Structures are given as C-alpha cells and as structure tokens.
Amino acid sequence: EIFSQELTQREANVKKVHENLEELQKKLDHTSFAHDRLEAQIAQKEQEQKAKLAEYDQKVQNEFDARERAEREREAARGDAAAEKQRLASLLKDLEKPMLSEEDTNILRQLFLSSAVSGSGKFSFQDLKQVLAKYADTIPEGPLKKLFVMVENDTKGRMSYITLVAVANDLAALVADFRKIDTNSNGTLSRKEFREHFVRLGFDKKSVQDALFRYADEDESDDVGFSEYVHLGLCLLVLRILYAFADFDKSGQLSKEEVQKVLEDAHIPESARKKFEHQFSVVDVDDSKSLSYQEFVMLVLLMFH
C-alpha cells in the first residue's frame, strides 16, 4: 500500500538488470566447455544490481520512517500521547538476549511495533541484515544458525534482491505490530491470540502452530512475550527468504532436490540431515511431493528444533 512511482520506477529497472543477468548466465550454464566473457558479464551485471538495490533500499527506509512517524501522530491525535509512549517502552524493554542498540531497537520498533512495514508491500534487506547480525550469536552454533547467517552474508547480493524485489510483498505480510496481536494489551500473546494471528498468515495446521508456539516460547509459559515474538518473527522472515532462494525452477514450491541443495549450499553436516528424506514426506502433507512455505517451515523446525 505504498503507492509511489519513484520506487515503482526503481523496482522496475533493477528488475531489468536482474532479468538481464539471469538470462545472460542462463547461457554460460549450457555452452559446451568450449574455449567466460559471460562469466565476465555475469560478474559485471552483478555489481550494478548491488549498487541499484543499494539506492533502492534507502528510498524504502525513508518511506518506512515517514510512515512510522505519520502513525505515531495519528495515535496521539487519538488517546493519551504518553499513555502510548509507555507501552512501546514497556514492550521494547523485554529485549533487555543480544547487544541491541538504540539503532537496532528502532528497526524492531518499526517492524514489530507499528504498521510502517506491515503490509506496505516493501521490505529492506539492509535493516534485516543488521538485526540478524546481532542475533545469530543468540543462536547456538549448529544448523539453524547457518540458515540464519546464509541470509546475512548476502552472497552476490542474491539475498538482497529477493528481499527488496522478489518477495518484499510477502516479507511485509509476515510482519505485524505486536500491539494489535495482543488483543488484551498485556505484554504477552496468549495461545489463542498467537494461533488466531498465525492462522491468517498461512498456518492453519494445529500441528504446525503448536510447533511455532513451542519455538517462540522459550522460558516455557503458555504465553508469548514481544521478545519471543520478535524471535519467532526474525526466523520466519529468514526461512521465507530462503524458501524463494531455493525455488530454482520458479515452480512456486520447493521440492526434495531443492531443499537438499540449500541445506547443502548452507553447509549443514550430513550428520544433521540424515532422517531428512523421511521427514520431507512427513511434512509434505498434501503429498504433492513439494513443500509450501508452511511445510518448509515445519520441516526446518522438526529437523533442527
């Protein structure tokens, strides 16, 4: 819902660069190993994208900022301008865990405590790269932390493109303002609210919901607090970006081969993905033999959590 040509224009062209590079490399990938310029051009059409996505990413942030401020206003205009300043600070306190600075906290304040990004149709890798950065640690070494850092390293900006252009509309729908979720205004999402929210993001399976609730809720209390919500929130974005990065055939849904090459691309020991084959089937509930975002999500969890 961010209708602004300066951006639309910007997204349209960066695409041209990508649809170019994409098509360019397509060749190299099946040109007999005959006596590399493609390899040259590839590398060439690849830096431009970064530079272009870089400029585009900042125009997006500026919009979000304006959107957030513009929202805080409306809030005051309504009830007590301070009866709200608190809630945010009370909630934002639960992060008091990694080394989150004012800078990062604000990014989270925008993502998880306002509708500036929520359903705006846009998203910025730059903001996401920064947070995941100071969050990996929290995650013990292992597989899940690898999926995490794979998104951050942003190799060749392939992650940057998927976030800003390819699945930005989808990344903004997975995000939401905790205060709207929490329909009773205590700093914790109940089992009912949790469900109710997540059922409207493509998670209708009870079996999978409990999976998410079990993921978020660490201190183990039938309630979920903004800080855990933020935790579950960053995990879904991440897996959501990898789900597309793994749809090499653009068919819409991942498949055994595809999922394998990501856990592979990602550097995940075979000693950690052995029952993999059996699980994929377990998760693959409609038997399509492919996985939907909701299934890839159950999978990841099941295997590494």
Nearer to Ca ion by C-beta: 261 or 274? 261
Which x/- pattern over 199-228 shows residues binding Ca ion (rule: CB under 5 A)? ------------------x-x-x-------
Q: Rank residues 96 and 286 by Cβ distance to Ca ion and give the closer one.
A: 286
Q: Is 114 annotated as a binding residue?
A: no
Residue of 150, 182, 231, 301 interacting with Ca ion (CB under 5 A): 182
Distance CA 258, CA 281 (A): 14
Shortest CB 245 distance to Ca ion, Å: 12
Check the annotation: does 249 bind a ligand: yes
**Please, what is the minimum distance in Å from the beta carbon of residue 167 to Ca ion?**
14
How far is it, in rounded angstroms, from Cα 44 to Cα 51? Answer: 11
- 141 is a site residue for Ca ion (CB under 5 A): no
Least distance (Å) between residue 291 CB and Ca ion: 5
Shortest CA distance to 203 belongs to which of 296, 83, 300? 296
Distances (CA, A) of 283 to 67, 178, 232, 250: 39, 29, 19, 21
- 58 labelled ligand-binding: no
Of 146, 117, 149, nearest in space to 132 by CA: 149
Q: What is the Cα–Cα distance from 221 to 82, expressed in whole angstroms? A: 30
**Stretch touching Ca ion by CB under 5 A, among 53-61, 79-87, 168-176, 178-186:** 178-186
281 scored as a contact of Ca ion (CB under 5 A): no
| Nearest CB to Ca ion, comparing residues 11 and 177 | 177
Nearer to Ca ion, 29 or 286 (CB): 286
- Quick one: 226 exposed, middle or buried, by C-beta within 10 A (0-12, 13-18, 19+)? buried
For residues 199 and 209, the answer to whether their CB atoms sit within 8 Å is: yes
Q: Is 288 annotated as a binding residue?
A: yes
Cβ-based nearer residue to Ca ion, 124 or 292: 292
Nearest Cα neighbor of 186 from 107, 87, 297 is 87
288: contact with Ca ion by CB under 5 A: yes
* Nearest-5° Cα angle at 224, 80 to 263: 125
Nearer to Ca ion, 64 or 229 (CB): 229
Cβ distance to Ca ion smaller for residue 29 or 219: 219
Q: Which of residues 241-270 bind Ca ion (CB under 5 A)?
A: 247, 249, 251
Ligand-binding site membership of 22 (annotated): no
* d(C-alpha 74, C-alpha 72), whole Å: 6
* DSSP-derived 3-state class of residue 290: strand
186 is in an annotated binding site: yes
For the chain, how far is it from start to end, CA to CA, in angstroms?
A: 36
Mode of pairing for the β-strands spanning 188-189 and 254-255: unpaired
CB of 300 vs Ca ion, minimal distance in Å: 15
Residues comprising the binding site for Ca(2+)? 182, 184, 186, 188, 193, 217, 219, 221, 223, 228, 247, 249, 251, 253, 258, 284, 286, 288, 290, 295
Task: Point out which residues bind Ca ion (CB under 5 A).
Answer: 182, 184, 217, 219, 221, 247, 249, 251, 286, 288, 290
